[PDB]
Design a protein around this ligand. Structure first.
Ligand code: HEM
Length: 291
């Protein structure tokens, strides 16, 4: 498959900035969701899950075709709980009916991170909705009950290397697990709706204890009320992952720069951009705009 980026006809920077503003303002307004964590965490989880179905071998999956909108992908077990992020973005799509689904889903992730005080993520437009028969089959998204060699091998299908995987994983400072969605329960830290290098600091500073949870799954629990998944705990079991974890713990700006590069690569995998295409857009925050 080739997937050529096609700008939505007649739209420019100013148009996409209005869709960003709309998402950012509704993030401000619906602050009560999930005990006052707000929708920002589920929105970056949604942008990583629409993107994480990609396979570099045959160019199937990825963010381009906006296929999460179809039943098969929407009802994938690994996506339980994302229906909340979909329902949030849906009034915004009715307001701007011209934006493609993959562009809206991916832009929700960019808006969430920058409004939660994160790095600026450059974003590119151009995904085109594709038919229901291009919807990836269930089962391409990663398991939590596994080790550092599973993680390295999995992320290789999206050709992410070690540094990219560790940086990407740092988005687990946001939000929390929910027993009814994934069989795991608890947050990764205290400030779970502000983007910081906290996940790395908890991983190197907490006295973690392995316990079974109410779903019979194992997880690492700390005295502080925080949890780590087996796949998360892997990053300090592997000698190569652990030097990067330490590096991000001592330097949030290096983590912000590397997370910025890898989240954009994750959102653009599987998409060919012609060089007549617009440069990546850097969107302003509500705060930068005085709104
Ligand atoms: C091996 C990789 C990964 C695994 C096994 C994994 C697994 C999970 C699980 C089990 C949950 C909890 C879902 C729930 O109960 O609602 C979760 C949540 C979340 N994940 Fe990951 N994760 C992985 C990678 C990533 C990456 C690369 C990102 C983002 C760039 C990410 C972002 C999030 C966010 C922000 C949440 C919280 C959402 C919320 O609060 O509802 N994850 N992850």
């Amino acid at each position: 498959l080739v997937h050529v980026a096609s700008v939505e006809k007649g739209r420019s920077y100013e148009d996409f900035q209005k869709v960003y503003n709309a998402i950012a303002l509704k993030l401000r307004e619906d602050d009560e969701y999930d005990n006052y964590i707000g929708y920002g965490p589920v929105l970056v989880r949604l942008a990583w899950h629409i993107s994480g179905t990609w396979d570099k071998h045959d160019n199937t999956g990825g963010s381009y075709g906006g296929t999460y909108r179809f039943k098969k992908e929407f009802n994938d077990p690994s996506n339980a709980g994302l229906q909340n992020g979909f329902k949030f973005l849906e009034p915004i799509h009715k307001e701007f009916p011209w934006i493609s689904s993959g562009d809206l889903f991916s832009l929700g992730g960019v808006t969430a991170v920058q409004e939660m005080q994160g790095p600026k993520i450059p974003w590119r437009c151009g995904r085109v909705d594709t038919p229901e028969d291009t919807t990836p089959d269930n089962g391409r998204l990663p398991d939590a009950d596994k080790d550092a060699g599973y993680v390295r091998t999995f992320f290789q299908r999206l050709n992410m290397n070690d540094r990219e995987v560790v940086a990407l994983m740092g988005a687990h400072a946001l939000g929390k697990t929910h027993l009814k969605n994934s069989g795991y329960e608890g947050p990764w830290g205290a400030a779970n709706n502000v983007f910081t290098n906290e996940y790395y600091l908890n991983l190197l500073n907490e006295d973690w204890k392995l316990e079974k949870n109410d779903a019979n799954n194992e997880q690492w629990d700390s005295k502080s009320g925080y949890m780590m998944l087996p796949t998360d705990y892997s990053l300090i079991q592997d000698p190569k992952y652990l030097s990067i974890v330490k590096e991000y713990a001592n330097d949030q700006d290096k983590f912000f720069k590397d997370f910025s590069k890898a989240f954009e690569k994750l959102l653009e995998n599987g998409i060919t951009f012609p060089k007549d295409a617009p440069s990546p857009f850097i969107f302003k925050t509500l705060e930068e705009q005085g709104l």
